[PDB]
Amino acid sequence: PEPGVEVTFYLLDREPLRLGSGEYTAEELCIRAAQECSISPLCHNLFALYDESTKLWYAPNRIITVDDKTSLRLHYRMRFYFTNWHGTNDNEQSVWRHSPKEAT
Amino acid sequence: PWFQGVKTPRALDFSEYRYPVATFQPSGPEFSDDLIL
C-alpha cells in the first residue's frame, strides 16, 4: 500500500527487509535475506524469489529498479524440493548427498 | 453417522525417528608474511 518495495518471509521474528533506493540484482537481495535469516551457504541456492500477485518467479540475473514510485511485495521462498527426502517412507528409496570415502 | 465411529488418526504413531546434519566445525589459520625478491 504505502510507497516502497518490501521483502517478506515466514518468520515473525525476522523483520522484513526495507529499502528506499539502490539498484539491485536478485542474487544480492537473496543472499541478503539468507544472511539475515542465517542460512548455511551450503543451502542458499535452494531458495529463490516469487511474486504472489503475479504468480511468477524472478530470474537469478534479473535486475530490479527503483524510481521513488515503484512498489511491490516479494516472497523469499525455497523452491527446489525432492519428494521422499526423509526415510519415513519405506515404500520408495530416499535421497542423500554424497560423502568422501553414513549417508549425509 | 460419525457419531458411531471413533478412531484415532493414523498419522500419530512414530517409528525410527529422523536426523539431519547439524553444522560444520569452524576452523581456519592465518600465518602469512610476505617479502619481495
Short mmCIF file of C-alpha atoms in Angstrom, two decimals:
data_model
loop_
_atom_site.label_atom_id
_atom_site.label_comp_id
_atom_site.label_asym_id
_atom_site.label_seq_id
_atom_site.Cartn_x
_atom_site.Cartn_y
_atom_site.Cartn_z
CA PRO A 1 0.00 0.00 0.00
CA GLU A 2 2.49 2.62 1.13
CA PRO A 3 5.12 3.50 -1.49
CA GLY A 4 8.05 1.11 -1.47
CA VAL A 5 9.26 -2.43 -2.11
CA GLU A 6 9.14 -4.96 0.73
CA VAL A 7 10.65 -8.41 1.12
CA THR A 8 8.57 -10.89 3.14
CA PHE A 9 9.40 -14.11 4.96
CA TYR A 10 7.58 -16.70 7.04
CA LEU A 11 9.06 -15.87 10.47
CA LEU A 12 7.63 -13.01 12.52
CA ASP A 13 10.90 -12.66 14.47
CA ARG A 14 12.77 -11.62 11.33
CA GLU A 15 11.84 -8.07 10.40
CA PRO A 16 11.07 -7.53 6.70
CA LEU A 17 13.74 -6.02 4.51
CA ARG A 18 13.11 -2.35 3.74
CA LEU A 19 14.79 -0.30 1.00
CA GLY A 20 14.28 3.21 -0.30
CA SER A 21 16.79 3.39 -3.14
CA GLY A 22 19.56 1.43 -4.79
CA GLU A 23 19.85 -0.65 -7.93
CA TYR A 24 19.93 -4.31 -7.03
CA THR A 25 20.21 -7.77 -8.55
CA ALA A 26 18.13 -10.70 -7.33
CA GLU A 27 21.14 -12.69 -6.10
CA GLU A 28 22.28 -9.83 -3.87
CA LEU A 29 18.91 -9.49 -2.15
CA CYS A 30 18.71 -13.29 -1.98
CA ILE A 31 21.99 -13.63 -0.09
CA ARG A 32 20.97 -10.60 1.98
CA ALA A 33 17.85 -12.47 3.07
CA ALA A 34 19.98 -15.56 3.66
CA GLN A 35 22.39 -13.59 5.85
CA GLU A 36 19.52 -12.06 7.82
CA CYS A 37 17.84 -15.43 8.39
CA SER A 38 21.19 -17.23 8.94
CA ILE A 39 21.12 -19.99 6.32
CA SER A 40 24.22 -22.04 5.59
CA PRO A 41 25.94 -21.24 2.27
CA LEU A 42 25.61 -24.95 1.52
CA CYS A 43 21.83 -24.42 1.29
CA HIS A 44 21.11 -20.91 -0.03
CA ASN A 45 20.75 -21.93 -3.70
CA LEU A 46 17.64 -23.96 -2.83
CA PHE A 47 15.82 -20.64 -2.34
CA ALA A 48 14.51 -18.09 -4.83
CA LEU A 49 12.03 -15.22 -5.16
CA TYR A 50 8.36 -15.34 -6.09
CA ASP A 51 5.53 -12.85 -6.68
CA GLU A 52 2.11 -13.92 -5.43
CA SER A 53 0.30 -11.07 -7.21
CA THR A 54 1.97 -12.17 -10.46
CA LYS A 55 2.30 -15.94 -9.83
CA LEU A 56 5.79 -15.67 -11.31
CA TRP A 57 9.36 -16.06 -10.08
CA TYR A 58 12.20 -13.65 -10.80
CA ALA A 59 15.32 -14.67 -12.68
CA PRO A 60 18.65 -15.11 -10.85
CA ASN A 61 20.18 -12.38 -13.04
CA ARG A 62 17.01 -10.27 -13.20
CA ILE A 63 17.52 -6.57 -12.46
CA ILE A 64 15.11 -4.67 -10.21
CA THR A 65 14.97 -0.88 -10.46
CA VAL A 66 13.56 1.68 -8.02
CA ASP A 67 12.31 5.09 -9.13
CA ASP A 68 10.87 6.55 -5.91
CA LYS A 69 7.46 5.47 -7.22
CA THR A 70 7.68 1.71 -7.69
CA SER A 71 6.30 -0.61 -5.01
CA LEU A 72 5.76 -4.36 -4.82
CA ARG A 73 5.80 -7.15 -2.24
CA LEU A 74 8.13 -10.11 -2.71
CA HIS A 75 8.50 -13.54 -1.12
CA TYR A 76 11.82 -15.27 -0.42
CA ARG A 77 10.85 -18.93 -0.75
CA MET A 78 12.54 -22.30 -1.13
CA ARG A 79 11.67 -23.84 -4.50
CA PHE A 80 13.60 -26.97 -5.50
CA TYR A 81 12.06 -29.75 -3.40
CA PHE A 82 12.61 -33.51 -3.64
CA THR A 83 9.98 -36.00 -2.51
CA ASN A 84 10.80 -38.76 -0.02
CA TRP A 85 13.85 -36.84 1.17
CA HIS A 86 13.07 -38.33 4.58
CA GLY A 87 13.44 -42.00 5.43
CA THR A 88 9.94 -42.37 6.88
CA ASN A 89 8.56 -43.55 3.53
CA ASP A 90 9.95 -47.08 3.26
CA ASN A 91 7.92 -47.75 0.10
CA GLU A 92 10.38 -45.73 -2.01
CA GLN A 93 14.10 -45.01 -1.95
CA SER A 94 15.11 -41.78 -0.24
CA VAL A 95 17.81 -39.32 -1.32
CA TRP A 96 21.08 -38.17 0.21
CA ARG A 97 24.21 -36.17 -0.54
CA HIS A 98 27.49 -37.81 -1.50
CA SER A 99 30.23 -38.31 1.08
CA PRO A 100 34.01 -38.66 0.75
CA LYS A 101 35.43 -42.15 1.09
CA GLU A 102 26.55 -42.87 6.89
CA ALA A 103 24.66 -41.02 4.17
CA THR A 104 24.68 -37.27 4.68
CA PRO B 1 -23.10 -41.05 11.10
CA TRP B 2 -19.68 -40.15 12.51
CA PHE B 3 -21.23 -40.22 15.99
CA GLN B 4 -20.97 -44.02 15.88
CA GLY B 5 -17.39 -44.04 14.56
CA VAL B 6 -14.39 -43.17 16.73
CA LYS B 7 -10.79 -43.80 15.70
CA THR B 8 -7.52 -42.02 16.34
CA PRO B 9 -5.80 -40.53 13.27
CA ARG B 10 -3.30 -42.88 11.67
CA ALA B 11 -0.68 -40.10 11.48
CA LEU B 12 0.07 -40.14 15.23
CA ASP B 13 2.28 -43.24 15.52
CA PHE B 14 6.04 -42.69 15.41
CA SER B 15 8.85 -45.01 14.38
CA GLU B 16 12.58 -44.98 13.57
CA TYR B 17 12.83 -41.21 14.12
CA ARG B 18 14.95 -38.99 11.85
CA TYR B 19 18.17 -37.00 11.82
CA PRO B 20 19.55 -34.07 9.79
CA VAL B 21 23.07 -32.66 9.55
CA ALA B 22 23.83 -30.34 12.45
CA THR B 23 26.56 -27.99 11.23
CA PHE B 24 30.22 -27.65 10.23
CA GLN B 25 33.07 -27.02 12.66
CA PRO B 26 34.56 -23.53 12.19
CA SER B 27 38.32 -23.63 11.76
CA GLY B 28 40.91 -21.55 9.91
CA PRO B 29 44.50 -20.44 10.43
CA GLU B 30 46.34 -17.33 9.27
CA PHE B 31 50.13 -17.10 9.26
CA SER B 32 51.04 -15.01 6.19
CA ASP B 33 54.03 -12.72 5.93
CA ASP B 34 55.48 -11.51 2.65
CA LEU B 35 58.74 -10.26 1.16
CA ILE B 36 59.85 -9.27 -2.34
CA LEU B 37 62.69 -10.90 -4.24
#
